[PDB]
Design a protein around this ligand. Structure first.
Ligand SMILES: Nc1ncnc2c1ncn2[C@@H]1O[C@H](COP(=O)(O)OP(=O)(O)NP(=O)(O)O)[C@@H](O)[C@H]1O
Ligand SMILES: [Mn+2]
Ligand SMILES: [Mn+2]
Lengths: 319, 10
């Protein structure tokens, strides 16, 4: 029911490895969205079909206040398109680069909302996000967390069901993934550990610009914290960043509940988090809907068979 | 500031 013509392509938002994300206005209804446009030519050649298909199903089969919702997804003869809920506030990576550090309160707020989303994916959808990072974490117009980018998800993951695939972002990879032995939904909690370390300390817990040496630290090096950091934060970060996933906070059968119960999250009402009752400690100051203030200026300035097969059951529309 | 990261799969 939806073609390329139906949208006004207004402003470039980003440009990943496999395609471009454009800010769009719907002609029929006037509301704004973010479109992920992917050339089939690339997808098939660069063996990305599987990820594309997992990302499509995951958006379709999820509805959470902190996951970007999919409106439509359609294909042309040559292109694949995900029409998504637009995140006005930009990436967390944007704001943290400018501010160096977030306060512990601000970190708790983002942390909780990411926990709420990841709990839902695990317990209710049997998904593991696998690719948690500052870039994949965006803010909506109010300043609530939106997790986008579902290309690296795994489906059909229940209890201690395990995976083998080496994927994610090198800086954020859990030790068990780097060891190349099986891993479960606990990799996400490692990932939460890393992003929350970044938020409260202003750096990755382990860093070298050489992937191999990077992985050396992730496997070997004992975690270290800034001397400013409070006891509750330090304990949570220690617990999330345990190298052995069976010792990790979140690593047991109780999954997300273990982290929710944690003293760092004391006084957080988890139902109120899901209902968005909590006051976002930062409000994006976007004037209009087309205000791309919080997206890196490098992007937001530019003008506009077997290689191109059909994608069975790709097209989707919501209620 | 740290550089932007790129996701991957084997
Ligand atoms: N729904 C959205 N709303 C606003 N901006 C978005 C949205 N989706 C994507 N972007 C921007 O576009 C960028 C690239 O999109 P993304 O879906 O993360 O692609 P990708 O190729 O899978 N990247 P990666 O897996 O991190 O190597 C993001 O970093 C955001 O800055
Ligand atoms: Mn991404
Ligand atoms: Mn991705």
């Amino acid at each position: 029911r939806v073609t390329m013509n139906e949208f006004e392509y207004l402003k470039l938002l980003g440009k990943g490895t496999f395609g471009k994300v454009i800010l769009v206005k719907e002609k029929a209804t006037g509301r704004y969205y973010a479109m992920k446009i992917l050339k089939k030519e690339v997808i098939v050649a660069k063996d990305e079909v599987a990820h594309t298909l997992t990302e499509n199903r995951v958006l379709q089969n999820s509805r959470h206040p902190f996951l970007t919702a999919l409106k439509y997804s359609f294909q042309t003869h040559d292109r694949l398109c995900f029409v998504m809920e637009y995140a006005n506030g930009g990436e967390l990576f944007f704001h943290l680069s400018r501010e160096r550090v977030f306060s512990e309160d601000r970190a708790r707020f983002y942390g909780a909302e990411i926990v709420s989303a990841l709990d839902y994916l695990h317990s209710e959808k049997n998904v593991v996000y696998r690719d948690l990072k500052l870039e994949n974490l965006m803010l909506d117009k109010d300043g609530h967390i939106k997790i986008t980018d579902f290309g690296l998800c795994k489906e059909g993951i229940k209890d201690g069901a395990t995976m083998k695939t080496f994927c994610g972002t090198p800086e954020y990879l859990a030790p068990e993934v780097l060891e190349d032995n099986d891993y479960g939904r606990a990799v996400d909690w490692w990932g939460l550990g890393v992003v929350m370390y970044e938020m409260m300390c202003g750096r990755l817990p382990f860093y070298n610009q050489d992937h191999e040496k990077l992985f050396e630290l992730i496997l070997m090096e004992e975690i270290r914290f800034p001397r400013t950091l409070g006891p509750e934060a330090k304990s949570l970060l220690s617990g999330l960043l345990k190298k052995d996933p069976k010792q990790r906070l979140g690593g047991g059968s109780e999954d997300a509940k273990e982290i929710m119960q944690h003293r760092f999250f004391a006084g957080i009402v988890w139902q109120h988090v899901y209902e968005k009752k909590l006051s976002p400690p930062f409000k994006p100051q976007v004037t209009s809907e087309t205000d791309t203030r919080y997206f890196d200026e490098e992007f937001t300035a530019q003008m506009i068979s077997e290689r191109r097969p059909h994608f069975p059951q790709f097209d989707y529309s919501a209620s | 500031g740290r550089p932007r990261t790129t996701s991957f799969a084997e």
